[PDB]
């Protein structure tokens, strides 16, 4: 997240570039994950839950087109 202002731009452009760099670097996520200790069991459980939910939503949207509402 190193942002050097180039020649002749307004401030807001530089601020937005810095914000985009921070968002793409995943900084706040890493600092919020590492605030409290997570047991290994909880980590595995949440990973499996995320995978299951993603697959279920994918199947639902895949089959959603064929049914028509009105």
């Amino acid at each position: 997240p190193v942002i050097k202002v180039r020649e002749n731009e307004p401030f807001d452009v530089a601020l937005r570039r810095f914000k985009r760099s921070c968002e793409k670097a995943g900084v706040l996520a890493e600092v919020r994950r590492r605030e409290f200790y997570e047991k290994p069991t909880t980590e595995r459980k949440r990973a499996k839950a995320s995978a299951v939910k993603r697959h279920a939503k994918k199947l639902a949207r895949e089959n959603a087109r064929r049914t028509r509402l009105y």
């Binding site: 760099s21 600092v31 200790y37």
Partner: protein, 117 residues
Amino acid sequence: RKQVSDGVAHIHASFNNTIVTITDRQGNALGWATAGGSGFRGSRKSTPFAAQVAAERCADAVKEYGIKNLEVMVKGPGPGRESTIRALNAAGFRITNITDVTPIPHXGCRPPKKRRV
């Protein structure tokens, strides 16, 4: 007492409070201001407005050295990150760099236990 004409702004933003300091390029401090020492205490100390006010007070407390060129380093997840930089620019300096320098363990130590609120 001395003229430096350029310096580094260190912003330390946390979930409870925000601290702003100005240093030279070698790290020696020149002045500082904080959101808790600006009349805001309690739930009002951890808001972007308090960070902006603290940045204004820090800028006003360092007029003597005649700084015009400024660099920004931000660490921490607190609300007062963008507001402080906006207020710092509104104070009249010209910002050359912006950087996030928040620490990251590459494993590190073991965090405290989760709160059962």
